[PDB]
Amino acid sequence: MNTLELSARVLECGAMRHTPAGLPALELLLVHESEVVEAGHPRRVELTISAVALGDLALLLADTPLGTEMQVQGFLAPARKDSVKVKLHLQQARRIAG
């Protein structure tokens, strides 16, 4: 089990790249903001996380306007081998239109 669901705004949207096998790959920077209750107390949560799309989601998310609201889900992986930093690997994403 490894699945993160998150609502966020696109803070940065990289240039479209491709793997050697020609697969589209895109890196984005997402910023999440919300209030949550912890142990029975209110708490502001502001999370910035790097996310990677590969394949069809990369094509879908390519050139997303900055500030765009999104709803994504995917799995967490270390940024780099043995890294304590984490990156979200997108499996689902949808661009919300205000």
Added chain:
Amino acid sequence: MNTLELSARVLECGAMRHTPAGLPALELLLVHESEVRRVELTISAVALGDLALLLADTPLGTEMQVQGFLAPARKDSVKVKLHLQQARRI
């Protein structure tokens, strides 16, 4: 919406403490295993109140199913922490 569901093994289980409000608090280190190399996801988790009592003194190596929200370890930190809202053994 900010919810992470994760199966993991307890790599580190800290000593239980208490916040300035007398609330029980515990810090653990969890490791999740995935395939393609040997992908090893490590995640620092924090348990409060009742969950801290449940997880306190958990033997290392123990398999857990956890759920909660992610937040930065601190102001502008590049590191994250999983704030546990649910957790269960085996």
